[PDB]
């Protein structure tokens, strides 16, 4: 069974055992207030939807999780590889007004309880991190650009060098994202990813016609995490494709660029 399992409402819980001490999951597209291409549980404030509808969708998740919206922390998600540590003093940033989101970063982490890290997705890879003994949680957004920038390994490096956590103490869930079944890219994308993988590494793409590659970004990020020292048995990977599973997910690719966003979230209850 997939590591992300359907709950009673419009969300999937991360069921990997090391995440049992955390509130961790990904929303699905149903149960909200938004309309048209955003129907209905659009969590993204940056996609041209009605802000009142989106805030109400966020308040609905907050009720399902018993984790108030005033305790969430969001980031700008610029498709880079930068990451910021956040604390209770950052609560609310980007929760109801996109302009207050943490600027210039694509991942967040915290060692405090009572802080819900909250990032938006509709094909890019959500990477959830936990160090259960040390009380750290993290969440990163990795499309091809962030993966080429090594965002996954950057989280591990920060936890090692700034938080004094060995990679062997980290566990990771790679959530629903677009699969190689649906994601075809050109030489420039794969050429950007090549230097981020070990020289002996199997390549997470297949050339399906000249200059066209079926790309597996989940696997690219898993390989980077392995190279950064996270143990194989600590990395859980969802098999759900956001483009294929149209009944559950918004997909930037399938929906031709105008669609909602799911929210990936992780935090610990205070
Ligand atoms: Zn993205
Ligand atoms: Zn697919």
Author numbering: 2 to 271
Give excerpts from the publication.
Here, we report FAMIN as a prototype of a new family of multifunctional purine enzymes conserved from bacteria to man. FAMIN and its prokaryotic orthologs additionally have adenosine deaminase, purine nucleoside phosphorylase, and S-methyl-5′-thioadenosine phosphorylase activity, hence, combine activities of the namesake enzymes of central purine metabolism. Consistent with DUF152 containing all enzymatic activity, recombinantly expressed DUF152 bacterial proteins YlmD and YfiH metabolized adenosine to inosine and adenine, MTA to adenine, and inosine to hypoxanthine. Crystal structures of several bacterial DUF152 proteins have been determined and revealed a monomeric α/β/α fold (Kim et al., 2006).
The His47 side chain inserted into the purine-binding pocket in apo-YlmD (semi-transparent representation). The His47 side chain may act as a gatekeeper of the active site that rotates outward when the substrate binds. Atypical laccase activity has been ascribed to some bacterial DUF152 proteins based on a spectrophotometric method that monitors the oxidation of proxy substrates (Beloqui et al., 2006). In this method, YlmD, YfiH, and FAMIN254I, in contrast to a conventional laccase, elicited only minuscule signals. In a sensitive LC-MS method (Perna et al., 2018), laccase end-products were only detected with a conventional laccase but not with YlmD, YfiH, or FAMIN254I.
